[PDB]
Amino acid sequence: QQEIQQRTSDMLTAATQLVQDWKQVETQVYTEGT
């Protein structure tokens, strides 16, 4: 059942990457010219 913990480890790495991808949101821009 080492496959269980190895699968949990790789899925956990992918999921931690996924939630730090979910977390960040960039700002806007504002542009004018006259």
Place this chain on the structure above:
Amino acid sequence: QQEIQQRTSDMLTAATQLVQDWKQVETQVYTEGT
């Protein structure tokens, strides 16, 4: 039985080579004149 994993070794890298080729996207360019 023993040839399977080393067969998947180069192939997984080849997909990993393939997986980032769609991630990058070049932006526009613009030119003016008079």
Place this chain on the structure above:
Amino acid sequence: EVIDKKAFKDMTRNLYPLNPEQVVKLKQIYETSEYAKAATPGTPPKPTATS
């Protein structure tokens, strides 16, 4: 050739350890956890003006 086919299967599983259903479920888990984090216990005050 069947060795190559099952190799394609296991390398696909090794590239992506996540099902899209699992992705959606964990995203819902993240949203509920964020809701719990942003939850305010008790009755909130009412905004009003005083004169």
Place this chain on the structure above:
Amino acid sequence: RIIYYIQAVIPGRAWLIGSNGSTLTVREGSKIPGYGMVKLIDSLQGRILTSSGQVIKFSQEDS
């Protein structure tokens, strides 16, 4: 009669506009004109349980 639409679903409180456009805000255990008291307010699915046993929702087309 007068029908209220929940305008800001929040845990604890609730902001409402009326069919007349009258604005108000309530808490969990309180009184509401046109329905008497308040029985249950939850952020789940936007349901307000009035003392008349009715389910105040928001506007139908404002979805």
Place this chain on the structure above:
Amino acid sequence: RIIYYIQAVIPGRAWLIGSNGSTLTVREGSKIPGYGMVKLIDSLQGRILTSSGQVIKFSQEDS
């Protein structure tokens, strides 16, 4: 009546226009004229099945 086409197909919401150019957006459960209410939104392949058993799709040329 009014023939409705699909404008934006996404999970959750949907965008529609009429035969006359009447732009609108719907949720999963809402009422539309001429077709009853929307009972199913399929994000795959872009078809909408109404409560009357009627299908909203794109234009034939603009599919």
Place this chain on the structure above:
Amino acid sequence: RIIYYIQAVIPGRAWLIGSNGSTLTVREGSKIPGYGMVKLIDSLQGRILTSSGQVIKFSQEDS
């Protein structure tokens, strides 16, 4: 008679405002006309007990 309501609730004292615009603060050992002597003070939930079995809390509007 004069209607009192709470503008602030703390441990230690209590803050009451009358319906006419007259406000004051009270402690455990004291008196109030129309309610009697403050037998106990509840810092929780903004409730003030008196000798006449009467509880001064916040207004229905100030809620």
Place this chain on the structure above:
Amino acid sequence: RIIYYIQAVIPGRAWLIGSNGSTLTVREGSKIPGYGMVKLIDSLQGRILTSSGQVIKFSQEDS
């Protein structure tokens, strides 16, 4: 009637040109007037097959 040719072929989408200025793009399920429906699109060797059995082909000298 109007005679067409294939002009530009990509997988998925097809482009056809008639001599009467009728140049459009079509899908696999597409209503071609005077011909009917497309039953098969091949990205190579330049044959577009109609549900009426016609074969849309490139110009052999514009080739």
